[PDB]
Design a protein around this ligand. Structure first.
Ligand code: E8N
Ligand code: E8N
Ligand code: ZN
Ligand code: ZN
Ligand code: ZN
Ligand code: ZN
Ligand code: ZN
Ligand code: ZN
Ligand code: ZN
Ligand code: ZN
Lengths: 331, 331
């Protein structure tokens, strides 16, 4: 807890600056970018789009993103390093497993999984020597038996290293409650855990029950909305029909309840996206042309106009991410 | 149909020699070997075990294997090339999709998939320039909607290039019938298709219905048996309780019915195996210490002793694979 691992090495806590805690360079599948780069036009075109996007984000004040792409999201840490160097934006990489693990992962024990997460945190990802600074896990409703092993192994890895855990939920099923019970049964401190996609729900009794016990709350999909996309079912099912304003007002709600130190904010944006319908990226880019700059350009001014102070917003976008990311057992 | 693509380039039909048509260097998942080589001891240990295994196979008469590992079996063509060069055994690589495609594949159209298979056949796998010489597909019972797209795209790729298709079935559900109907609805010639795992069933009415219409029959798992593995459920569910002799006698049955030109024989062996329970490889290696040499060392003498001629066996192990692998629309 003097240093956070990024794809270009250790940085100090003050270097992190304004940090987006849930993003993706590319939302894909393991091996997919190497096997089928033309899906994205080309590898070089994906690089360029990401570099330009991160440069716009940097010009709006962003200094670091946490790329929460796992193995099964097709995380390519060389791609991340390349993009990070060209855009002059720090990128923290992730270990863990999301919702699409292949058989070679799904057949593993809790102990085996813990070894895998530990490898990626303590030694390096693949042969790159790049180390993950965060562990990403997932459920979508009631955990499957394998997802329970994942959550346990994430807890064990976090307990050995101090690196935080961040989660994918189906927020309407209140999955944070089950995630929390499993993490706690392994002895993990809630202050090392972000329950993500929590802006997908308006249930304050769920959000406050998590925050009351010490969890960080990931209000991480603020520009996800299909409002005013006429007759696009696939975009609707992915993005929802709640407005970005509704999502953003959750940030204010939690501040008003005393939880300003526990809120993490992000876009959950990407520059490529192969794990859904073809051309989702173009649909998403039309909905939110600011991409990752959407938080500083649109959300911050919206909240200031609703009465949230500049100091409070800086605490949420700079202090909370540094405190979350800094390795420790108890933050 | 003067040349077959291998992981070290084109070879002529007579160079193929005695060919095992359904094998694996490593049965894994995309990205898995690169991310977690220690699962296999090490990458170098996997290489060594495979080299020694293929050397024993070569000393028993094998000259070529067809590695039917796809993308989602974690096919690593550089690993295959390395092993092939050190063992002096030709390896044909595969494209297609088996039973574990990730989301980035499962969301694709028939046209998109056809482009992907065509890439791997006509251009190269990843950035290696190595081209697949066969297309591998799979069902396990009634095809899912995505598996139907896979089978169609395999047919389309085969129709453009002449490269054959080979299949995984759940033979007890007679999946070959549905596979055949889909391939035929795309216009594919049965003489370009091997219906694999066909030695998993004793149903002659199923096997002959496929052979009668021109399909090749993959009797490809001959040493798979859990007989005399006391109380090992996982090995039993994978390997079955029919003896290798029972499987091998299917070769004789089809010869006796007039189908000697349509039989392809293999072990469906591997040197690493991460997509099942931990230590399956050790269990499998104790059941069949000859590995890929099991066909020439054990099956061939068994069939000669039951009255099959040497010439017939050479036609099955040399001529049928050359005729199957040689690119053409109608073999
Ligand atoms: C103490 C919380 C506060 C009044 C500070 C400024 C941001 C909005 C709420
Ligand atoms: C014509 C088929 C045959 C009598 C030849 C030798 C192998 C066994 C059957
Ligand atoms: Zn998610
Ligand atoms: Zn507690
Ligand atoms: Zn939603
Ligand atoms: Zn995400
Ligand atoms: Zn199979
Ligand atoms: Zn026909
Ligand atoms: Zn069986
Ligand atoms: Zn196989």
């Amino acid at each position: 807890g003097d240093r956070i691992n990024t794809v270009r090495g250790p940085i100090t806590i003050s270097e992190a600056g304004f940090t987006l805690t849930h993003e993706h360079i590319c939302g894909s599948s393991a091996g997919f970018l190497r096997a089928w780069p033309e899906f994205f036009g080309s590898r070089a075109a994906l690089v360029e789009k990401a570099v330009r996007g991160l440069r716009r984000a940097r010009a709006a004040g962003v200094r670091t993103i946490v790329d929460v792409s796992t193995f099964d999201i097709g995380r390519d840490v060389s791609l991340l390093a390349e993009v990070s160097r060209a855009a002059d934006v720090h990128i923290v990489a992730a270990t863990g497993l999301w919702e699409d693990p292949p058989l070679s992962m799904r057949l593993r024990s809790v102990e085996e999984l813990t070894q895998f997460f530990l490898r990626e945190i303590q030694y390096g990802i693949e042969d790159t020597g790049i180390r993950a600074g965060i562990i990403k896990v997932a459920t979508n409703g009631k955990a499957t038996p394998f997802q329970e092993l994942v959550l346990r192994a994430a807890a064990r890895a976090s307990l050995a290293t101090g690196v935080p855990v961040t989660t994918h939920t189906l927020a309407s099923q209140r999955d944070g409650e089950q995630q929390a019970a499993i993490f706690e049964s392994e002895g993990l401190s809630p202050s090392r855990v972000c329950i993500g996609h929590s802006d997908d729900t308006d249930d304050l009794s769920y959000l406050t029950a998590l925050a009351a016990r010490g969890y960080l709350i990931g209000l991480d999909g603020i520009p996800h909305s299909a409002i005013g996309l006429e007759d696009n079912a696939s975009a609707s099912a992915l993005l929802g029909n709640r407005s970005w304003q509704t999502r953003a007002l959750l940030i204010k709600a939690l501040i008003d309840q005393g939880y300003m130190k526990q809120i993490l904010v992000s876009n959950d944006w990407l520059f490529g996206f192969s794990s859904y319908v073809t051309n989702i990226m173009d649909v998403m880019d039309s909905v939110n042309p600011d991409g990752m700059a959407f938080i500083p350009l649109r959300v911050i001014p919206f909240l200031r106009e609703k009465g949230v102070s500049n100091e409070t917003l800086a605490g949420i976008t700079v202090t909370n991410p540094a405190r979350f990311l800094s390795p420790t057992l108890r933050a």
